[PDB]
Amino acid sequence: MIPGEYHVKPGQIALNTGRATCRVVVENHGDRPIQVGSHYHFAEVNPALKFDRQQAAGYRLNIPAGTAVRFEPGQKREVELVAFAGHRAVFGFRGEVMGPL
Amino acid sequence: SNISRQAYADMFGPTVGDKVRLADTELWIEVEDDLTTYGEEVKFGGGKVIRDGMGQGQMLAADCVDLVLTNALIVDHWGIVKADIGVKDGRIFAIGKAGNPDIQPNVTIPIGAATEVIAAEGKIVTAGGIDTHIHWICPQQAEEALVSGVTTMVGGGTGPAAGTHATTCTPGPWYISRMLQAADSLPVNIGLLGKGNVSQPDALREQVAAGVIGLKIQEDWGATPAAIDCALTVADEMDIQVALHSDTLNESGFVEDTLAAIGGRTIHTFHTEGAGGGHAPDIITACAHPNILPSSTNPTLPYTLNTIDEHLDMLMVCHHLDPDIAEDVAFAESRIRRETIAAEDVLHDLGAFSLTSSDSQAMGRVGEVILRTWQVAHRMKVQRGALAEETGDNDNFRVKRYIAKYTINPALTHGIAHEVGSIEVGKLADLVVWSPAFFGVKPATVIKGGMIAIAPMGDINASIPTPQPVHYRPMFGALGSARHHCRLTFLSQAAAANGVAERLNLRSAIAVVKGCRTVQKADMVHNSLQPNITVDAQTYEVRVDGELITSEPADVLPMAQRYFLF
Amino acid sequence: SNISRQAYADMFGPTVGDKVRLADTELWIEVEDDLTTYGEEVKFGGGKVIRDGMGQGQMLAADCVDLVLTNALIVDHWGIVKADIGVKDGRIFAIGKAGNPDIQPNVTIPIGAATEVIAAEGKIVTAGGIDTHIHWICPQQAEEALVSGVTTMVGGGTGPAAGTHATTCTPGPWYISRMLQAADSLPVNIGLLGKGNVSQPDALREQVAAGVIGLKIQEDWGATPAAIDCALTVADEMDIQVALHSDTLNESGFVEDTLAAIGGRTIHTFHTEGAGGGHAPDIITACAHPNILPSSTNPTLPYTLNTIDEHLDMLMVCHHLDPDIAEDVAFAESRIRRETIAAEDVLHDLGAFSLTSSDSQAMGRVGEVILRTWQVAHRMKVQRGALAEETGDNDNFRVKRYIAKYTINPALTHGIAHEVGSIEVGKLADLVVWSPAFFGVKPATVIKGGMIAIAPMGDINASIPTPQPVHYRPMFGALGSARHHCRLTFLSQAAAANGVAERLNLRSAIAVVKGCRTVQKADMVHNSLQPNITVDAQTYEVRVDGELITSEPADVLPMAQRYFLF
Amino acid sequence: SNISRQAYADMFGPTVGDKVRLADTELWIEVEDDLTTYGEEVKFGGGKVIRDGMGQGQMLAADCVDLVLTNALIVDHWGIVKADIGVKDGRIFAIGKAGNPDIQPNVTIPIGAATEVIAAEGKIVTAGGIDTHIHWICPQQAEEALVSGVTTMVGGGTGPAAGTHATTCTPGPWYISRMLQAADSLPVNIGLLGKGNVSQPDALREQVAAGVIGLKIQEDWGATPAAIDCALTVADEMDIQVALHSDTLNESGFVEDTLAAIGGRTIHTFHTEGAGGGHAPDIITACAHPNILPSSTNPTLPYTLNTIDEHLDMLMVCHHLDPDIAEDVAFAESRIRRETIAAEDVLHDLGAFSLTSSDSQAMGRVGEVILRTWQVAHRMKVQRGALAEETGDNDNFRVKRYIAKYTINPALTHGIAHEVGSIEVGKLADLVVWSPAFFGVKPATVIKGGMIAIAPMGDINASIPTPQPVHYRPMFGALGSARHHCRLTFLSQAAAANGVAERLNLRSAIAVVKGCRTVQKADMVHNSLQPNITVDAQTYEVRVDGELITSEPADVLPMAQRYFLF
Amino acid sequence: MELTPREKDKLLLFTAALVAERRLARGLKLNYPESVALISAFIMEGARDGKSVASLMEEGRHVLTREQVMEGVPEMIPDIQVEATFPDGSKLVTVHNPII
Amino acid sequence: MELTPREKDKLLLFTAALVAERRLARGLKLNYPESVALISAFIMEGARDGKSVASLMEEGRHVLTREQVMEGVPEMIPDIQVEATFPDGSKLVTVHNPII
Ligand code: NI
Ligand code: NI
Ligand code: NI
Ligand code: NI
Ligand code: NI
Ligand code: NI
């Protein structure tokens, strides 16, 4: 008996189902670490991260909401992205879109 | 992408199919539905989702909510679901999926720059409780009740005076006016009851026109057929509720005579079991009638080993009885019966009794309405097993039946359900956030009209709000003008029309009661049973359809010694 | 029907001929009269008298009282009688027989649906005390005084500042305005005193026009003949009172010179004995004059074993004196004299000294005015026996003489007796209910303007208000708008006329002072003695008509260690 | 006549040439000037100077001050001088020589009947502190800060909600309005900050028009270049200040990118060292720019043995990070660096960092801003010796440099220096009186707008205010209407124009912010250094002009265990 | 701890009892507040131990005797009442004529 | 003494700990508030003694064991946090899983 205990049923949850995804190789060319969040518009991340920005347009990291991927200096790795939904209007970040798409 | 259900539960709280134990009881609830889109849950913190352009949009204040409770597990009479809650203008805006429509799907609760966030993942959110049997013996009761999770208090009194010690009555225009003015200082919604014991209707109309939302008939002031009739007549006229504490002495007649005087008119019977007052020994038979809205006070909930022992002296002090006067002690003893006390618990489980209340400092504990309601539920599951209406391997229905007792039902009974009583769109945002381990005992946050009014708070000088000592302290929602904007003072339609608020210069938001005469037993959510109940005049045994209704006294109870320092 | 007097006393409290001991003192009071009709007493509770059609009538609110104190034993300057007390519109309606005229005889206080009940059987009820020597060093003093039974506080100050530490002065229009606004937050009636030490009348008129009801002359600001004359001239003009703390140093002249400067004009002499300040060593001779209203501060009341020992350092801290400066210590020592301290007690017993006060946190204890007054009475009975005016075997007259010292006399002296000071019809309902065993020490209930403002209260979550811990907590009469309606802020006639209340937006009820210049020693109730008193310049011995006036120091006192935790 | 300097010091406090140790530190201040005329000093008490015709004149209220602080030793950014302080209409009237011009020479501060006196001989008087990094997590913080000597609090929040736990943001018009109304109940001057994280300018303009005096950019809400630019644009338009907590994750770019986004526009960088948040690991390089006003939060001040150890868990709780999520812990660790923590102390000593703040209950201690600032000064003197600007054998300049950090500089940075920030003529009378032995730790008196708001107070029932227990209790300046008159609620020029005060019915005095966009590093009093600073990306070593900047951690600190019970 | 007002209120009673406990230890005859506090605290601990209301109503009458208190004190305390959390929840314990 | 609000607040914690201390002495299994109070007070005294934050973060995990508290209590206290005045000023002590 543990007060307020959970009885979680076993299994897994499939995240962001039915959405377009794509994988890209990213490399941190900066001398300081860079960490990216789950919903940040990937195409507008720190310029020190070298990758195909054109492909990442309208995409974010396909990871559990609230988590992040960290890139130490010189670190190269392949990440999976998932496309934005809703109105697919990008506002903010580095101010490169500021509108639909 | 995939994630295990356990990791998911740890991150965003439980989802569909997961079960949670309520505090240290044997009651388990199962998430019935989840309104989120897996992968799109909103979370606040460094590097999280709720950030500009991401989980937070570009909309102006008018197009977004003021407050959002993320990943909340709602427990209400209509369901036990996982969802985000949006609050706007101090009221419940929506229950659904929060976020930014610019990049997220299915957003029904828009988050913008004008939105504050309360993280409810792993927490249970319920509506604020409503106690309708308050004796205004002292103002300190308000804070005690608020801390327990009760946000609305209906009752009567003028302070620690003899009349108030025994009855829930605010006698006359002068006292009614003074108490209405004093109400502005308390962090809970308030509605007052006047003294209904009189056979001259004008004496009652004055009180209603002064501001009371109901009239209390108490035997200490004379619960005679003439007084009862007079009060009910005025009630039908002015759309206010009548609360009854019948003639225990059987002086003017027996229970059937009182029922005859009521004549099928809507009435709320206080402490229907009897210990708190009422025709000895069969006032409990009142729950069989369609026009009766029956409630229980909390000392008898639930039936335990020490229950009987503590009652005699409690009774005497409350009603100003003399232990040296034989007739005074005999009448006290006639009110305490193991038989009716045991049956009351079962009647609640069956839905024959629709409300739970305190009877604050007058044979009742103001901070124990919610706590005791859940102890009864626990004891009933332990003794009777699953309810007939229960589906699945959980106690979802029993939970819904019991939560309705101190939320929606009290609101319906007193004509305030249009403002409070449940987590529904348009209602005042009176919400209580609980950690599963402390559910019904000690809340994590108490929100009054959209603002946190009280919550546990650690060292004020600490680097974070969590260091010890952690104890309940009033927040901004309980301060001066902010408080006035986040609380409601209920008035009768007559008082509101006469401009009582402007005359007394009441500063809080005003709400009017309505629908008090049309409510009946059939309207009590999950508690509409009208049993063919009888009480043996000599043995006091309670029977429903000839079957004996009884239960066993608890030796130990959950939500007790594991949580309190004293 | 018949009933034994003992059973009767236990049920309705004592009646004509019965005696009651005041707390643990040797003072006994005897019920002089009973205004009831035996058999028709009103009692509240289950199955009692005050019920519809019975002890409660059918009259509308306008035709009945708001509150009734049943079976109260009144102790006031005019008598010690048993009666019911009726309160209506926050004021004393009547003293007589309560009930329902429909079925009861001799009812003078009608009880109806709009009537609240306070059971006073077995209790003693007195008027709220009035302390006229308050140093507003901190706001907490108000609650301390209220708890002791003092409902009106007159004094001056701006907070813990040097000037206020030593004097009862609220200097100038700005501070006066700020303090008047702050007064709305305190649960006691308040009247302010300005700084009267100046030789320019206009500087004084400004303060009076600003709101003060009196002017304080203190030696620390220069109690010179010129300043005294200036203040008295303005006082005669604006109908306000002057309080004096004379020139201890004899710097500008001796006591006779100060008396000459006063020129027969009405004046209230603070701490007339001398320890608290005044011409050394004969300021006490002031009580011989007709225009002097003499009072005592409480540290010297009564003369005990430890009295002298505690005074030196108390003196120094209060008046900002330096113990290293010889002249500062010499002047402190010249104020402490066993001779005058001993005589003061006797002079009170004889009625030569008419008032008692505190001198809060400036050589006086704010919560001990009432307590110490009764200790003096006790010690005087013990040493001097019965008073010459005493009739019967009781201390009724001595009690009346002493209660007048902190009730009616202070009210008369400051021109507020038309509002408060005694239990008389038309006066504000400031009443204190006491249990005989705790009389003068710890009250059962403190009523401000018709509402209970503070009272001992037990466990807030308890089933009744009596469980421990029981300690004083503020009630509804001390909350926001209710408080404003139940308290009074006294203003000078000039301030009231200039619209000061509207300008400062004061929210409490306003009362104006009047009759300050016409009151004289002969008007002090039971304390109008003008003795032919002298003080020996070398020995400091006090003599009245050549007889030496003295007393013995108490080693132990009642109303002390049996009641307090610390 | 002559008097020894020691006797003089004991009587009127120290004079020109005398030195005083600040609390138990190694910091010594030397009286630079004395504005008195030897022999004409004013002193209050029995037989002292301030008396009618003597040290007190015959002038009307309009021609004299309301309050005078006698013989005060002022410590302010402009000097450490001995003088009398005059206060009139709640504001600083003059700094000079008080008395009566009728008989005394060089009187610049006239004392009359309308003047109250506060004896400051032997005491140090400073301006009230200004904390600009307040998280309104709970209202209790106000009293804690007031007790420490802070009289103005700028920040944001809505109570104990997730958003407020991590950020100083009051999100949107509704919450802004509620908090402005709640502010009237707090005894400190208040200014609010809205949520500046959005890329739509209108969403920001709404908040400013609603009442906020600044906008907070926090990384938890997304500190992206787009959001930063948007906020600065609105700031330049509406004359409000921007506070920044940069992108620690380097997600949107590095420190240089953020600096680029700012584009030379005025901005206040919170916790510039980094631990409290900011580009890892070089946000500290921001102090090199002319448009940056850099401040420090207090947990890292000063560098001690236990500093590093306590930070990890503090960080996690504040920002809602999960210790089980590797990326969450990695990002927490990247913020805690011994290198930058050590350098910060030295940078303050050099004047590169201009302000000190708390970051109340969100990685900061609300009652320790002043205390910790002096501990840094002490540790720096101990390690680095005298400053280059220091003249004479004293620490006068270092003291001036450090006091400016929590007084005038915070005021200049947020555009409120026209109202508060220093002891200068015309400014609001927010003053703190200290006993040298308790300087910076526990004040003797805290004055808000001319009235004592809080101070240590002994036994309320005592014969004097000094007997134990002595603890801080609220005074008249913190009561109802008096409080409203003695405090200020700062509004944006837009809000003031739109009539927000009248609409919300705010009762306190209103003040408007201005000059937020024109202030630059060169304007920071005694703290205008713009060092050529660099941070090694791998080692985190801080260097100024190639020289390594570092310091040693303290094992024991003054103003700690000798003063606190816990 | 998340202490509610009632829990904090009880801490006041506990502390008052500590004062009485130490004075009784010195051999002093207890006064009114000291006696009430001592007996009340005793009952609260009894509840924590799990004793029944019935047991405590009796045991509470044997904490202090007439010879351990000042004159008049027994008569000033016709009864003592206090509530505490028993294994079965909050209950009221009323001790009549506790000092004999 | 010139006690600030925070000092007075800590007095509440100290008193709560005295209650727990005496019950543990009786041999009772401590409940939720009692356990939190006891461990917290221990840490405060440690700070007064001059122990380091690092030392206390470890020592605090050995004040109470699973067998000295009621069932469920260890799980109700994932950590305990308290601040006190160390020789080098106020510091935060966080004890993870204090009861094992
Ligand atoms: Ni009842
Ligand atoms: Ni009731
Ligand atoms: Ni005096
Ligand atoms: Ni005085
Ligand atoms: Ni920050
Ligand atoms: Ni912050």
Swiss-Prot record, chain A:
pH-related activity note: Optimum pH is 7.75.
Segment forming the signal sequence: none
Disulfide bonds: none
Keywords: Cytoplasm, Hydrolase
Any one GO BP annotation for this protein: urea catabolic process
GO cellular component, one term: urease complex
Pathway recorded for this protein: Nitrogen metabolism; urea degradation; CO(2) and NH(3) from urea (urease route): step 1/1
Catalyses which reaction(s): urea + 2 H2O + H(+) = hydrogencarbonate + 2 NH4(+)
Major localization listed first in the record, in broad terms: cytoplasm
Class of this enzyme: hydrolase
Pfam families noted in UniProt: Urease_beta
GO function terms (MF aspect): urease activity
Family to which this protein belongs: Belongs to the urease beta subunit family.
Descriptive protein name: Urease subunit beta
Organism the protein comes from: Klebsiella aerogenes (Enterobacter aerogenes)
Lineage: Bacteria, Pseudomonadati, Pseudomonadota, Gammaproteobacteria, Enterobacterales
Gene that encodes it: ureB
From Swiss-Prot, chains B, C, D:
Organism: Klebsiella aerogenes
Listed name of the protein: Urease subunit alpha
Cofactor binding, per record: Binds 2 nickel ions per subunit.
UniProt-listed NCBIfam families: PRK13206.1, PRK13207.1, urease_alph
A GO BP entry: urea catabolic process
Cofactor annotation: Ni cation
Keywords from the named record: Cytoplasm, Hydrolase, Metal-binding, Nickel
Impact after mutating residue 133 to A: Abrogates activity and reduces binding to nickel ions
Keyword Cytoplasm found: yes
Subunit details: Heterotrimer of UreA (gamma), UreB (beta) and UreC (alpha) subunits. Three heterotrimers associate to form the active enzyme. The apoenzyme interacts with an accessory complex composed of UreD, UreF and UreG, which is required for the assembly of the nickel containing metallocenter of UreC. The UreE protein may also play a direct role as a metallochaperone in nickel transfer to the urease apoprotein.
Alphabetized CDD domains for the sequence: Urease_alpha
Annotated Gene Ontology cellular component terms: cytoplasm
Domain named Urease: residues: 128-566
Effect upon mutating residue 245 to A: Abrogates activity and reduces binding to nickel ions
Lineage: Bacteria, Pseudomonadati, Pseudomonadota, Gammaproteobacteria, Enterobacterales
Consequence recorded when altering residue 220 to A: Reduces activity 1000-fold and increases KM 10-fold
Molecular function GO labels: nickel cation binding; urease activity
Documented activity regulation: The apoenzyme can be activated in vitro in the presence of nickel ions and carbon dioxide, which promotes carboxylation of Lys-216.
Residues holding Ni(2+) 2: 216, 245, 271
pH dependence per the UniProt record: Optimum pH is 7.75.
Compartments it resides in: Cytoplasm
Outcome, altering residue 319 to A: Reduces activity 100000-fold, but increases KM only 3-fold; optimum pH is 6.75. Resistant to inactivation by diethylpyrocarbonate and iodoacetamide
Swiss-Prot record, chains E, F:
Catalytic reaction(s) noted: urea + 2 H2O + H(+) = hydrogencarbonate + 2 NH4(+)
Keywords linked to the UniProt accession: Cytoplasm, Hydrolase
Keyword Hydrolase: yes
Molecular function in Gene Ontology: nickel cation binding; urease activity
pH dependence of activity: Optimum pH is 7.75.
Top-level enzyme category: hydrolase
Broad class of where this protein is predominantly found: cytoplasm
Any one of the GO CC terms: cytoplasm
Coiled coil (residue ranges): none
The gene coding this protein: ureA
Subunit comment: Heterotrimer of UreA (gamma), UreB (beta) and UreC (alpha) subunits. Three heterotrimers associate to form the active enzyme. The apoenzyme interacts with an accessory complex composed of UreD, UreF and UreG, which is required for the assembly of the nickel containing metallocenter of UreC. The UreE protein may also play a direct role as a metallochaperone in nickel transfer to the urease apoprotein.
Regulation: The apoenzyme can be activated in vitro in the presence of nickel ions and carbon dioxide, which promotes carbamylation of 'Lys-217' of the UreC (alpha) subunit.
Pathway linked to the protein: Nitrogen metabolism; urea degradation; CO(2) and NH(3) from urea (urease route): step 1/1
Family membership: Belongs to the urease gamma subunit family.
EC number: 3.5.1.5
Any Pfam family hit: Urease_gamma
Protein name: Urease subunit gamma
GO biological process, one term: urea catabolic process
Subcellular location: Cytoplasm
